[PDB]
């Protein structure tokens, strides 16, 4: 999440695909 | 908090407004 940003939703941009986010908040709530 | 930077204080700027900053780490830190 800090290397990227969130705008919009993937039901418009053409040839996009999935992948998974390593939010740095999670693993720091969980230590 | 991701999209400002903060520095110096609110007395020095000239023209300055007041409003609300949205902090990822509350609604995380809550949930």
Same mark, same amino acid.
Request: charged letters at 15%; aromatic letters at 6%.
């Given at each position: 999440t800090d /290397? =990227?940003?969130v705008s919009g939703n993937c $039901?418009?941009?053409i040839?996009?695909?999935n /992948? =998974?986010?390593y939010d740095? +908040?999670?693993p720091? +709530? $969980?230590s």
């Open positions: /290397n =990227t940003f $039901d418009v941009v040839g996009i695909v /992948n =998974t986010v740095p +908040l999670q720091e +709530l $969980d």
